[PDB]
Single-chain antibody
Framework: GSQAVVTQESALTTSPGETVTLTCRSS?????????ANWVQEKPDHLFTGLIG???NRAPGVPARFSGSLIGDKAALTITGAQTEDEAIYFC?????????FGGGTKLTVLGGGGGSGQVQLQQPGAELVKPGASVKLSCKAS????????MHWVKQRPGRGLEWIGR????????KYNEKFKSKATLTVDKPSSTAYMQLSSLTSEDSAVYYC???????????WGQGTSVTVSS
């Protein structure tokens, strides 16, 4: 199959102090708790952080004004009292049996000045230039937590185009799950001494030019902490 499409509002405009609800629809029918909906916020300069996962579980440190739920046949993120710093692009991700599928993202605009209410690191190298047909080994160094206690995800962004889930590794086990789209193009591995996750992209091509993020994932919870992304450019 793999014809499932996730759609979100293109844009929403609000003011400080208002209640805004972003929704996430599945093309296959209703969104269910078996879609374990995740919500991720992109602030300017491609800074990602996960807010919600498992429909309603809250990421570490996410402000009280955010909450997740199912509303009718959609997943929904509600901001109860929007603040100017909430101006961002919000992406949902739905689980479809063996892969995550990201929506297109909602750009939230917060108009007018206002008020509002006021550790773990993943370290990725900024860039990598590769020659066609070669490989790259991408690193993601985790610090601040027990490395083997959390899964690690990899996400591809061709910027402007969208987000695509590549796959997942359990550091404790070495067990992997790959998006079929990348099952032979990508291999996930770890080094537990150095607490480093690695993704190898075999025999590259021009489509492969993108930013690749690693993201810490707690099963049933959020894709919470993200690396800065490695910009991989292919010489053409």
């Amino acid at each position: 199959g793999s014809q499932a499409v996730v759609t979100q509002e293109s844009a929403l405009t609000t003011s400080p102090g208002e209640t805004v609800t972003l929704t996430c629809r599945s093309s296959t029918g209703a969104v269910t708790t078996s879609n374990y909906a995740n919500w991720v916020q992109e602030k300017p300069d491609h800074l990602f952080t996960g807010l919600i996962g498992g429909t309603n579980n809250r990421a570490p440190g996410v402000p009280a004004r955010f909450s997740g739920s199912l509303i009718g046949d959609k997943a929904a993120l509600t901001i109860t009292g929007a603040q100017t710093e909430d101006e961002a692009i919000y992406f949902c991700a739905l689980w479809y049996s063996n892969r995550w599928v990201f929506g297109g993202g909602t750009k939230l605009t917060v108009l007018g000045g206002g008020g509002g209410s006021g550790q773990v690191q993943l370290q990725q190298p900024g860039a990598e230039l590769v020659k066609p047909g070669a490989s790259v080994k991408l690193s993601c160094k985790a610090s601040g937590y027990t490395f083997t206690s959390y899964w690690m995800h990899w996400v591809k962004q061709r910027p402007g185009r969208g987000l695509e889930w590549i796959g997942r590794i359990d550091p404790n086990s070495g067990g992997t799950k790959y998006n079929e789209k990348f099952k032979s193009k990508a291999t996930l591995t770890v080094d537990k001494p150095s607490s480093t996750a690695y993704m190898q992209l075999s025999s590259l091509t021009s489509e492969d030019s993108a930013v690749y993020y690693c993201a810490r994932y707690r099963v049933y919870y959020a894709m919470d902490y993200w690396g800065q992304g490695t910009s991989v450019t292919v010489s053409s």
